[PDB]
Chain length 102, copies 2
């Protein structure tokens, strides 16, 4: 049933604020992270997006089959290696929210 | 279309709902979704609840282009329901518009 899936699907919004100097380096790190992550079981969509009038606000938008998939994502090798690098690029701590459809 | 997706515009509308106001909010979202899905340019629209926090209710959306979204926030149902939605909030609703990179 595609309703049941609808109800267990997870979406994360991961909003980053980036150091103007570190943008190119940030982007190169997302490139590898997307390639890897798109190959995982449960990844429905995963992309990085930029707020319109704000070139340095760069958000991660994802959808995962379910909660345990997201759980494998953050326990994965690539996440583990790239997350810390990605974090050196930021003005502030990344602000993350995990949602479900109501 | 991978290409649609590539030009689509996404919005994250974060609302802090008042604990008691939550159910009026949702009945208001019901009609809002209903009319909005009937709109052209609207790929995906839905209200989501934050897992940690049952008061945070966000609108996640995908539009074929800016123009479509301009129409949407000018529609009758948007103009009719949006102000009623804000009756329910603790802050002004926090809106972000995104373009894929």
């Amino acid at each position: 049933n595609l309703y049941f899936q609808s109800m267990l699907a997870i979406r994360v919004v991961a909003k980053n604020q980036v150091k103007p100097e570190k943008v190119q380096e940030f982007m190169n790190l997302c490139k590898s992270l997307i390639e890897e992550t798109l190959k995982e079981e449960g990844c429905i969509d995963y992309g990085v997006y930029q707020e319109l009038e704000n070139p340095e606000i760069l958000t991660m938008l994802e959808e995962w089959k379910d909660e345990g998939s997201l759980d494998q994502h953050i326990r994965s090798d690539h996440f583990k290696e790239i997350f810390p690098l990605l974090s050196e690029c930021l003005d502030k701590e990344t602000e993350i929210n995990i949602y479900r459809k109501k």
